[model samples]
Target: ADYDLKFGMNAGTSSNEYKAAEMFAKEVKEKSQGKIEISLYPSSQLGDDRAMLKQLKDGSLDFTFAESARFQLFYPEAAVFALPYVISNYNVAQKALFDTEFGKDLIKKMDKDLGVTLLSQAYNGTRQTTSNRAINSIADMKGLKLRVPNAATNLAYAKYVGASPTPMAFSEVYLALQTNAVDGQENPLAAVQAQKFYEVQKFLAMTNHILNDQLYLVSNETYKELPEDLQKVVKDAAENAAKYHTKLFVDGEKDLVTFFEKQGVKITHPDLVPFKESMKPYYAEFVKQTGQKGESALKQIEAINP
Candidate 1:
């Protein structure tokens, strides 16, 4: 058991997170010829995503697939990946940046500067709002305490929509909803089902506020201990995980509605025009900060697709 690796995830068995984690673990074991094994700890068994990341930093946890935008606190530039509409489609997003030169350069800087290594990056899909209350428009978000992940982008999205963003860990969301700590939360369909958020929430609005991609990272302790060849194999395994997860997520969207409907969760796809229009101020503030670097990154992505 000396070399058995442990991977932490915020999501439960109901998500693509668990599926991807299992696939990655299987690949790592097979590719490494059983010399390495990746044991997954789902549903925050290793604590919340933030806690898992902290463990990775301090050399406690071995590996994890963490949301990219959350890394803004450590490196604000990472928030570029979470930008609204930067990626028109999932395939474009993956090839344009996450799996490209800019992605590598950004990860290199993150590793050297933040002491965190990014093994691979994968798509988690766009985040949207779901509620137990009626929210037909952005104005409906006013005075609502919406559950949001503890990240700058998500908070900014909440602000943009006029909701009082309640930053709660994913593990606490169910109780938070049941106890009225929040009226609703924003997440992908996979997450809504994975966390049983549909059980507490009734109304669903497709705000698609922030598109997310997660990074598979490793603790410096465990990473440095691996032989060079083993490190290469692990890195390759991450690529395999990324590709598989991306495809599954994109394909599951149509089926997600069926699952949610069976659970009595009503889904809505409102006109996103007003929602995008509302986020102008936040976008302006973002461009002001990143300036040329941010524009360049956006341009790089735009060239790939639109």
Candidate 2:
């Protein structure tokens, strides 16, 4: 009965997110004096994001490192963080908008829909367009089937770029690339190396297009039952995990580029101006789906001076 608390996160041990989850578990154990224990389920052994989200809602699963954008499916306003060319720097990412009015409101909405409580968010770094072929210009993306997370932002960006956006679970992407189930995928460099996508993918366009923020959340029911002191300990531990994970990812980025090149993956510093210009339609689509005010959040996010 004393060890009833369990936290299961949805990512592979090889993933930076899982590293954060482990760090959180470690801190929580130390801080809670063994009153709480966090159990992590990595590598889709439990399920993909959507399935894991379902588990969170039914209180079957305790926690997850969810993409802020995908988390927005339940809290649509979190789309503000996923817009291309916004909050690319970790400081701005951690400061300005993610903790701003819109973000808090979105988290509240997420709780309403998914039955979970967002404790803290951490930097997952910028996503790059990697492929088996060069993607220097917008034209290069033509006929490319890019694997996209099941999120509207990725879907909209892929549509705008003229690449076929095939929604796929993150775990399946490597095989999907080998079999050519998808031509390429977008991810941070840590993922590119950790997943060893270099064996098949040939390019790493330094798009840095979308800055990703990963959220650490626990089931609302589970959170509500924590002792007040235990809740504070868990919250602080989650924050510590986030800070530690950011350092892990930031340092990994520089190393991965060299690692990727040695393994024969061409790294391209594509002029993102054209890609940025081409995404005008995506902003419009955001407006169409979310209305002028909601869409304005995307524009404001882009103008955050990060």
Candidate 3:
């Protein structure tokens, strides 16, 4: 049979991730002279990230995207990627992935155990806080009902920052903010605009808590079955797609505050020192859970000059 592939993801159709994925699909189809065709299933048409990753491993899915923090489902120490202000910014995050021993080993572990090929990584924007109420300082976080995805690291950020951590799905976040079921939620600014969270929430707090790296993962089952030429096509397309993905986030971040302000969303900058200071214990607990492996990842990340 000629190769036909399925690419699935949790991002909605309008997202930068989805757009880059569309670009990738087009590139693969054209470069392979139609020998390979990749279809997309956006908006979690397949399932959540965890479920989609499972599909990739089982050979039921071809491609999907997940952030380094999302890798914690199989590798707990990978949770270090999102341990609240640890990576500093995108420069450190990208370097830590390729330059650190932890990242190189994790890549091998994914192919061997998780059965996926980590083809490329793209900037997924830095996570920041949005709320109906103002957050002028770290002290203001007290008792705020901050909604987070079902990630322990995100929950820790809320808890240690003194917010009441309310874990919920991203699909439900807008309404949760609207109805006061939650006081706030956090995501990249591009997401706040794409998901229309700006309409329901009033204050955008630049917590810059987490930096996300979107990995373009191809199922090893699919990759190993492809003709070598087609495999090269897919790999090159992924790299091009990642570069495009980074541009969207980097360019988007530069102008998003102005966009939000136009929508009447007041922006605030809380002193990040106290915010960064709050994560020390959480980091310790992560090392305790993951041992020397997690410890080394942390040291290696800080060693990166970014």
Candidate 4:
């Protein structure tokens, strides 16, 4: 009852991101004994992640979820997290974030420079490509208009792979696909299911270009204001919710292909050698912008095995 907080994110209520946040709110409210309450604003109701992170910066927003790649705007080396084909799976992603020097520094930078605290990280999913037409091979991607979230790394994934990147908000993607405004889009299977992209898109390709981690983050102002006891409860609840979130995605990935097939969406598994090869230019540009720090981080990530 003493503190009311706001948590903002881009996922809709039907999404695992929202489900995890809901679990967090319930646990924190229970453990804090009503001392702290959190209100969730999902589906970009508050704004996109970039906008919400700004809200967090000023303490206008209490919490939000972001991938390390989302932090590329503030810390370019963070882009290593989403480098096409660099990260193998959720296990490697976790190690790269906490075990590597770049990730450790990123957590510190968020608290100090970004005015946000990292509470926890959970597996989002590995991204796959979906198109209106079957993409049987890398050659099929040339000039395909692909809808991507407004994140630079995602745009880069499309551009370097020979697709024209059409950056847009997640909320508008279904309609965009329905009208053929974009020839295709790329996202995790769970995202495809949540957004009902399969209803509009006809094919799912095993591009597996990038993996994502949904981070639980809180504004420093809100965090510091909490009593020590309440703070611990919040952190614990967040970590608990994070694991549950990973479970949702892990389970979803197990059977989603069959689910898609039953819905009449054809699935394809193209050889990924060319997909990875196409990213050479993007990686070069990435190292150029981030210099040695980026190069080192990329190596650290590659050294990690799933």
TM-score on alpha carbons, each prediction? 0.75, 0.82, 0.90, 0.87
**Top candidate, metric TM-score:** 3
Per-residue lDDT of model 4, residues 84-179, tens digit only: 888868898899989998889889999999999999999998899999999999899998999998877788888888899998877888998899
Q: 91-158 in candidate 1: lDDT tens per residue?
A: 66566555666666777765676557888777777777888787877678898899887766778878
lDDT of 3 by residue, 144-217 (tens): 99998887778999999999999888888889899999999977787788889999998999898988889999
What CA RMSD would you report for each candidate?
A: 4.1, 3.4, 2.4, 2.8
Stretches of candidate 4 off by over 4 Å are 142-151, 163-183
- Return the clash pairs for model 4, or none: 1-34
TM-score of the candidate numbered 4?
Answer: 0.87
In order of TM-score, best first, we have 3, 4, 2, 1
Pairs clashing in candidate 1? Answer: none
Winner on lDDT between 1 and 4 is 4
Q: Between candidates 3 and 4, name the one with more favorable TM-score.
A: 3
lDDT of 4: 0.90
Steric collisions counted per model: 0, 0, 0, 1
- Count: clashes, candidate 4: 1
Residue-wise lDDT of candidate 2 within 1-306, one digit each (tens)? 244555555556777888788889888888888878888788777788788878878888878778777755654555656776555667667664455666666667778967888888888878888897898888888899988888667777787777898998888889999988799998777777778899989888987778877878888877878788888988898888888888877887888888888988988887777777878877676678777656756755665565
